[PDB]
């Protein structure tokens, strides 16, 4: 089977300043903690929950 690809997120490191909820695990990302936020969509997550973020990335 040949190689097809899926749109991945473009994660940038952002410090949590507002109330945030991790998309994969549903839990809150606490103040001052590092979070991964997609440049293209609304997806935000814990650094450790990164691989479980819903695919493909659909820019918002
Ligand atoms: Zn995305
Ligand atoms: Zn999480």
UniProtKB/Swiss-Prot annotation:
Highly expressed in testis, thymus and placenta. Expressed at lower levels in spleen and peripheral blood lymphocytes. In testis, expression is restricted to germ cells with the highest levels of expression found in spermatocytes. Expression is regulated in a cell cycle-dependent manner and peaks during G2/M phase. It comes from the Eukaryota. Transmembrane segments: none annotated. A zinc finger (Phorbol-ester/DAG-type) spans 8-57. Phosphorylated at multiple sites in the midbody during cytokinesis. Phosphorylation on multiple serine residues by PLK1 enhances its association with ECT2 and is critical for cleavage furrow formation. Changing residue 11 to G: Cytokinesis failure. Induction: Expression is down-regulated during macrophage differention of HL-60 cells. It is found in: Nucleus; Cytoplasm; Cytoplasm, Cytoskeleton, Spindle; Cytoplasmic vesicle, Secretory vesicle, Acrosome. Component of the centralspindlin complex that serves as a microtubule-dependent and Rho-mediated signaling required for the myosin contractile ring formation during the cell cycle cytokinesis. Required for proper attachment of the midbody to the cell membrane during cytokinesis. Sequentially binds to ECT2 and RAB11FIP3 which regulates cleavage furrow ingression and abscission during cytokinesis. Plays key roles in controlling cell growth and differentiation of hematopoietic cells through mechanisms other than regulating Rac GTPase activity. Has a critical role in erythropoiesis. Heterotetramer of two molecules each of RACGAP1 and KIF23. Found in the centralspindlin complex. Associates with alpha-, beta- and gamma-tubulin and microtubules. Interacts via its Rho-GAP domain with RND2. Associates with AURKB during M phase. Interacts via its Rho-GAP domain and basic region with PRC1. The interaction with PRC1 inhibits its GAP activity towards CDC42 in vitro, which may be required for maintaining normal spindle morphology. Interacts with SLC26A8 via its N-terminus. It is linked to Anemia, congenital dyserythropoietic, 3B, autosomal recessive: An autosomal recessive blood disorder characterized by marked dyserythropoiesis, hemolytic anemia, macrocytosis in the peripheral blood, and giant multinucleated erythroblasts in the bone marrow. This is Rac GTPase-activating protein 1. The gene is RACGAP1. The chain holds residues 284 to 338 of 632 of the full protein.
């Amino acid at each position: 089977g040949p190689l097809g690809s899926m749109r991945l997120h473009d994660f940038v490191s952002k410090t949590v300043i507002k109330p945030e909820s991790c998309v994969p695990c549903g839990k809150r990302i606490k103040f001052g903690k590092l979070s991964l936020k997609c440049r293209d969509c609304r997806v935000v997550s814990h650094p450790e929950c990164r691989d479980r973020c819903p695919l493909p990335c659909i820019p918002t």
